[PDB]
């Protein structure tokens, strides 16, 4: 089967600045008179869509700041001016021989100015406590860059191993991330302790921010 | 032009599952049709294709186990999957390939342009191959606290993926973040969906999270209120 390889696998770029992605086939994609090499864009939470076909033809709706070039076995996707809405994963695909095969994907990340998170803490709902479980949620909202640290403290005891984090894909308009950390406790343990706190460390914060609440207040 | 996949859900290893794809706003019988799959977080792998004359093609990873078929009368493509393995767990997309037709004196033809491209893709159907059973979620409110306020819903303890969440039946989309699900140590998934809104709206604007977990037939609308 044809092996497709793409580079770089991550591409950070500032809106307004150009970008390019290289693809390389293990065999020639020329049919002595078309070359069957395509580019697909997968935006966050969407399926792939065709961006360029046959090396250099733009699919419907694709503006001319995108172009493709190459020949035989080496190909390049170029964007002359990136926009924040370009965030996604770009894939090369050969169609000269079944099975069609894809390169690994290049994740375009949009660079922007540092943005500190807004932090919010949520106690377990009375509804959940009635069910017999307790989840505390800490939300870090609309921040950049992605690296953030969340620590949980329960009556000043550091929690280790009983929380899980989930992070959004970069937003297509403001190029930020959001993050949730969920601390899981049994109802008995939640009801034994008083102060619940999430401490956030981020490049945009001059010192760590703590949001906390007292069970019952 | 639209492709809408159906059939996705949970199946145990060794069993079989049939996906369908309904085509609309295009002459279905005049296109080749393909299936491509993607394990969440990973790249793309071509699964199968059927020409407008019903010839079928397969890579070796599924050859012998999957069968593609079409019923032009119904504007539908099918992928019958047998002897499933955990590693076939993936989102399966149907996609339209080369365009052509049939003329009835001269036979099948293809347009030269776009012949080996996939120009229309469906939204995908997640197939999960697992010996765990279906479990519907609990939906709990994340109440806004006592500038900008945050609220949400916690969709806890469900299997398999996926769950969808909208706010106010789709009317509320700005400021909404629905997080990727996390697999808890129990083997069930959980996710949170949050929205940031003006604090001044909390007394008067109604916020409702609409949760849908199709594998368990669980649909819930949960009003989230300040306490």
Residue numbers in the entry:
A (entry chain L): 1 to 27, 27A, 27B, 27C, 27D, 28 to 213
B (entry chain H): 2 to 82, 82A, 82B, 82C, 83 to 100, 100A, 100B, 100C, ...
The authors write:
We found that adjuvanted protein or mRNA-LNP immunization of rhesus macaques with ApexGT6, an Env trimer engineered to bind Apex bnAb precursors, consistently induced Apex bnAb-related precursors with long HCDR3s bearing bnAb-like sequence motifs. Cryo-electron microscopy revealed that elicited Apex bnAb-related HCDR3s possessed structures combining elements of several prototype Apex bnAbs. The primary hurdle to eliciting Apex bnAbs is believed to be the low frequency of bnAb-precursor B cells possessing a long (≥ 24 amino acid [aa]) and acidic HCDR3 that can penetrate the glycan shield and bind to the positively charged surface within the Apex epitopic region. We designed a slightly improved germline-targeting trimer, ApexGT6, with affinity for additional PCT64- and PG9-class precursors, and we evaluated B cell responses to this trimer delivered as an adjuvanted soluble protein or mRNA-encoded membrane-anchored protein in RMs.
We also determined crystal structures of unliganded RM018 and RM038, whereas RM017 did not crystallize. Overall, the HCDR3 of RM038 exhibited hybrid features of PCT64 and PG9 when interacting with the apex epitope of ApexGT6.
